[model samples]
Target: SNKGAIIGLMVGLVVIATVIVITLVMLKKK
Candidate 1:
């Protein structure tokens, strides 16, 4: 369905963004 596809894309983007943020934070701490 269109709705499910949209939600999936949004969730994927959010997850990727979170991983990027966490990686940056860890690098800074190191």
Candidate 2:
């Protein structure tokens, strides 16, 4: 359970980073 949650946190960070990058791209496009 600990490892699973730890991995989830990493995934969460990656997802957040991806969202931020996508937002930047969309802003640039606009």
lDDT (CA) for every model shown? 0.84, 0.83
Model 2 residue 26 distance off true place after TM-score fit, in angstroms:
1.3
Candidate no. 2 TM-score: 0.45
Of the candidates shown, which would achieve the greatest lDDT relative to the real structure?
A: 1
Q: Write the per-residue lDDT of candidate 2 for residues 1-30, one digit (tens) a residue.
A: 668868968987898898888888778978
Candidate 2 regions with alpha-carbon error over 4 angstroms: 1-8
| Residue range 1-30, candidate 1, lDDT tens digits | 768769978987898898888888778978
Compute the lDDT of residue 15 as modeled in candidate 1: 82
**Candidate 1, position 5, lDDT:** 65
lDDT (Cα, 0-100) at 19 in candidate 2: 82
| Model 1 lDDT on a 0 to 1 scale | 0.84
